[PDB]
Amino acid sequence: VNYVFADEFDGPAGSSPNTSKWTIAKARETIKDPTYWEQPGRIGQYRDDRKNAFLDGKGNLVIRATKEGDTYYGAKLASVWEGGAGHTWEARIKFNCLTAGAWPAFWLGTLGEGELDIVEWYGNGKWPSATTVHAKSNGGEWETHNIAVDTAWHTWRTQWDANGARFWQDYTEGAKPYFEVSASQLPDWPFNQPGYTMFVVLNLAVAGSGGEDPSGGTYPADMLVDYVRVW
């Protein structure tokens, strides 16, 4: 109805996503005490390069992982805008990047405590793909729900407020959410804090703990996003 945030990703093929709306990561996060695939020489990089994040000219954002030399590159977009409790947030996404080493995600983040991982897929061959509600930044308090991810188009929707968070895949009117978490489930539930707001993140990383080894994978690896809408 009345959207408080939206991008329909319109624009010519090969053009940049809207840089006034999205912060495109210029480097992968530096990691204290890295695991094997988080080491600086093995982890996937992020950059603001049209080879890794571009509009397709048909109304989709493409976030793309590529290999150049011995280095893999992906991309991460984070909204400048932030929204608080009581909204519904949805993206329509097609994951064509479900390959060894890849680690796509659609999530709501904060620099403070808490995170809503709406859909995450792990190319490490070890971890189930999942939707996760995190109460703490240390990753020490959460509720998670395993989901299965195919390569078809889906909508991924969350609604969250002070009292809980709910998730739907391919929402239709009256559908029961596939996963719901109430405030009572997490002692350190942060989402009821006054003024608490979250930004939208869409990203495709390579390697790190979630992706691990990209050898033998299919690159370029593509994550397509038709829109993000919040109301």
8 touching Ca ion, by CB under 5 A: yes
Nearest-approach distance from CB 15 to Ca ion, in angstroms: 13
State how far the alpha carbon of 230 is from the alpha carbons of 1, 14, 70, 132, 176, in Å: 10, 26, 39, 19, 19
Radius of gyration, alpha carbons of the chain: 17
Give the nearer residue to Ca ion in terms of CB position, either 8 or 29.
8
Q: Is 33 left (phi over 0), alpha (psi -120 to 50) or beta?
A: left
Instruction: Verify binding: residue 112, Ca ion, rule CB under 5 A.
Output: no
Tell me the number of residues near Ca ion by CB under 5 A: 5
Q: Would you say 226 is a known binding-site residue?
A: yes
Using rule CB under 5 A, residue 226 touches Ca ion: yes
Instruction: Specify which residues 182 forms β-bridges with.
Output: 164
Of the pair 9, 107, the CB lying nearest Ca ion is at 9
Is 139 among the annotated ligand-binding positions?
Answer: no
Beta strands in the chain (DSSP E): 5-7, 22-24, 45-46, 53-55, 61-68, 71-79, 87-96, 102-109, 115-120, 130-134, 142-146, 153-160, 164-169, 179-182, 199-206, 221-230
The residue from 5, 9, 167, 191 that contacts Ca ion (CB under 5 A) is: 9
CB of 60 to Ca ion, least distance (A): 6
Closer to Ca ion by Cβ: residue 212 or 226: 226
Shorter beta-carbon distance to Ca ion: residue 60 or 169:
60
Residue nearest Ca ion (C-beta atom) = 59
Is 59 a binding residue for Ca ion by CB under 5 A? The answer is: yes
- The residues binding Ca ion (CB under 5 A) are 8-9, 59, 226-227
Task: Please state the residue numbers annotated as binding site for Ca(2+).
Answer: 8, 59, 226
